[PDB]
Amino acid sequence: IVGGYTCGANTVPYQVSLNSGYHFCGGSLINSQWVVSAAHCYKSGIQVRLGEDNINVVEGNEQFISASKSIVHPSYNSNTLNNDIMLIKLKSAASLNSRVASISLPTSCASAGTQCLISGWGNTKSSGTSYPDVLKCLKAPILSDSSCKSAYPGQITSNMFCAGYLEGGKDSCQGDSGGPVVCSGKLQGIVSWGSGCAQKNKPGVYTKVCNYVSWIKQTIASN
Numbered sequence: 001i002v003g004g005y006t007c008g009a010n011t012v013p014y015q016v017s018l019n020s021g022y023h024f025c026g027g028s029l030i031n032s033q034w035v036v037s038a039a040h041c042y043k044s045g046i047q048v049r050l051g052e053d054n055i056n057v058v059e060g061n062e063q064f065i066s067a068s069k070s071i072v073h074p075s076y077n078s079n080t081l082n083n084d085i086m087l088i089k090l091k092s093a094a095s096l097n098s099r100v101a102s103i104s105l106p107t108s109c110a111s112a113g114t115q116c117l118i119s120g121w122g123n124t125k126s127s128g129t130s131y132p133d134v135l136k137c138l139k140a141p142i143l144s145d146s147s148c149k150s151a152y153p154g155q156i157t158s159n160m161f162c163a164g165y166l167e168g169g170k171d172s173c174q175g176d177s178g179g180p181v182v183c184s185g186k187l188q189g190i191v192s193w194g195s196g197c198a199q200k201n202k203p204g205v206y207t208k209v210c211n212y213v214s215w216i217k218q219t220i221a222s223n
């Protein structure tokens, strides 16, 4: 997260960190047993870390659970990142508390101009490398399709949307991938790609979660 702010310990209880020796992606808890993330976060042997703030200190509220299953969307394309969505089953259930709680799936798509909360432990610098101790937060609106497609000619599909700031300065970055875009208590986006970080006329692109609510539900029911 570039140009964001410190969320505060467990103010974002559905945020998880995906760890493979190191934090490499975020994710969202949707029930006691499942995580929504980005398909391009797939790795063998992921460990899911819930209840985290300082990801570099054992602080007491953390839960550490291995991924038992890792389901990439069957139409995912890693060249274009269309259908960039993945579901992670926890080998055991998460103990839901005030520090650790799930996020609702959308009943309907959000619309351009809606304000959202983007969070994660990714890079906090444009043109550099500086990953944070504590979870970072960003307030950011869904942008219009015409803004998105003029920012990214010939690259935006019906399963993506832009959000953030055309002026730049404030954006998600490397390390936030798979992380939540929450708008009005609903999980509407997944941190996906972007051209650089926080640069002018290069907003972030996000997986349009509302297009997948039936997939998520059937997949949870079949596994």
Ligand SMILES: CC[C@H](C)[C@@H](c1cn(CCCCN)nn1)n1cc(COc2ccc(C(=N)N)cc2OC)nn1
Pocket: 040, 041, 123, 128, 129, 171, 172, 173, 174, 175, 176, 177, 191, 192, 193, 194, 195, 196, 197, 198, 202, 203, 204, 205
């Ligand atoms: C795990 C996939 C991939 C292998 C890996 C990765 C690491 N490097 C090298 C970095 C050196 C420069 N620091 N290249 N690809 N990766 C990609 C991402 C997502 O990246 C972005 C997300 C959002 C935005 C946004 N403007 N909103 C921008 C993003 O990047 C432009 N995170 N890790």
Ligand SMILES: [Ca+2]
Pocket: 052, 053, 054, 055, 056, 057, 058, 059, 060, 062
């Ligand atoms: Ca911790």
